[PDB]
């Protein structure tokens, strides 16, 4: 076997690179190197990447599926494989994920606990399990406040594929939301968040005054943004540590069960009105 573990990502969300770094630190312990290849949300590219890594006989694959409706060819299954972040629609393939519903529930509830009772939602593609999880968290919070869901308020990145696609979706969605006088926004990944912030910046409107916002995925830049950004923070170190341990046991042929972790909200400045 090659001493490479192939980490197949869907996009350039720093989230994946931060998890990578953790996986990598732990794996070099057993003289395993991690290599990363991005599918850019293209499914044909994802298939080409798996097929190359199988052919190369890598030690293992960690797949972040571009869509949840996807089957592993019988010919690939000789390689230890697990998924991360997202689940596939029907496998006994072990995964590592967070509680996506809780996460978006916490985030949505926080915006509601201000004056804002009509919350814009920015979602990625609904073919992804994390999108469905996050949509369900939003719905649950809305309902707890005895509000009606307004499908008008929910936007998806379902037009194009990849990193920049997601950013533009957040931007254009937010630009629309702001134009309707929406005052509260939950952006459910780092890139959708960056697009939201682009639209808000470009407009006249002032965070904490005209609009409030909760994002997902932390960065050192959230603490130095004006105003500081409240986000759902994912447990990236722990996820990386656990995935590295899950992947080692798979490489040794031991039984492994799926793990789900917990996010936490980091309250800063952007989620409350002055």
Site residues, a second copy (CB under 8 A): 2-4, 6, 12, 14, 17-18, 20-21, 24, 28, 31, 33-38, 40, 45, 48-49, 52, 55-56, 163, 167, 194, 197-198, 201, 220-221, 223-226
Nearer residue to Cl ion within complex by CB, 90 or 179: 90
Token pair belonging to 193: 């968040």
CA atoms of 82 and 258, how far apart (whole Å): 9
Nearest to 243 by CA among 61, 44, 48: 61
Nearer residue to Cl ion within complex by CB, 72 or 132: 132
Q: Shortest gap between Cβ of 229 and a second copy (angstroms)? A: 11
CA atoms of 43 and 49, how far apart (whole Å): 10
Q: Shortest gap between Cβ of 22 and Cl ion (angstroms)? A: 21
For residue 93, the partner it binds in a second copy, Cl ion, none, with Cβ less than 5 to 8 A by kind, is: none
| Strands 33-38 and 2-9, bridge-based pairing | parallel
Nearer residue to a second copy within complex by CB, 67 or 268: 268
Sign of CA dihedral 25, 28, 29, 32: positive
Phi-psi region of 109 (alpha: psi -120 to 50; beta: other; left: phi over 0): alpha
CA atoms of 136 and 107, how far apart (whole Å): 12
Q: Shortest gap between Cβ of 260 and a second copy (angstroms)? A: 26
Q: Residue 38 belongs to what H/E stretch?
A: strand 33-38
Contact status: 137 vs Cl ion (CB under 5 A): no
Q: Shortest gap between Cβ of 52 and a second copy (angstroms)? A: 5
Q: Shortest gap between Cβ of 1 and a second copy (angstroms)? A: 10
CA atoms of 274 and 263, how far apart (whole Å): 27
> Site mask, Cl ion, residues 25-64, x = CB under 5 A?
----------------------------------------
Give the range of 21-29, 97-105, 113-121, 138-146 binding Cl ion by CB under 5 A.
97-105
Contact status: 68 vs Cl ion (CB under 5 A): no
Q: How far is CA 10 from CA 35, 66, 242, 250, in A?
A: 14, 6, 20, 22
Nearer residue to a second copy within complex by CB, 58 or 106: 58
> Contact positions toward Cl ion, by CB under 5 A?
100-101, 133
């Amino acid at each position: 076997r090659s001493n490479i573990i192939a980490f197949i990502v869907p996009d350039q969300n720093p989230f994946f690179t931060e998890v990578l770094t953790e996986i990598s630190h732990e794996c070099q312990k057993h003289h395993l190197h991690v290599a990363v290849a991005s599918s850019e949300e293209n499914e044909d590219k994802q298939q080409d990447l798996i097929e190359t890594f199988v052919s190369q006989n890598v030690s293992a694959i960690i797949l972040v599926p571009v869509k949840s409706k996807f089957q592993m060819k019988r010919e690939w299954l000789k390689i230890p494989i697990m998924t991360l972040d997202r689940e596939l629609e029907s496998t006994s393939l072990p995964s590592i994920t967070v509680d996506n519903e809780e996460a978006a529930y916490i985030a949505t509830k926080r915006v509601l606990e201000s004056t804002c009772k009509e919350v814009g939602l920015l979602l990625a593609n609904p073919n992804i399990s994390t999108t469905i999880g996050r949509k369900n968290g939003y719905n649950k919070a809305i309902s707890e406040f005895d509000l009606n869901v307004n499908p008008s308020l929910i936007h998806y990145s379902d037009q194009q594929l990849g990193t920049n696609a997601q950013i533009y979706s957040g931007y254009e969605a937010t630009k629309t939301l702001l134009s309707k006088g929406i005052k509260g926004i939950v952006a459910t990944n780092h890139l959708l968040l960056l697009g939201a912030l682009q639209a808000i910046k470009e407009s006249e409107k002032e965070i904490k005054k005209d609009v409030i916002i909760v994002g997902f995925d932390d960065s050192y830049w959230n603490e130095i943004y004006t105003p500081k950004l409240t986000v759902i923070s994912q447990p990236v170190k722990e996820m990386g540590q656990v995935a590295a341990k899950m992947i080692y046991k798979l490489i040794k042929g031991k039984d492994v069960t799926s793990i789900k972790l917990s996010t936490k909200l980091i309250i800063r400045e952007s989620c409350s009105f002055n």
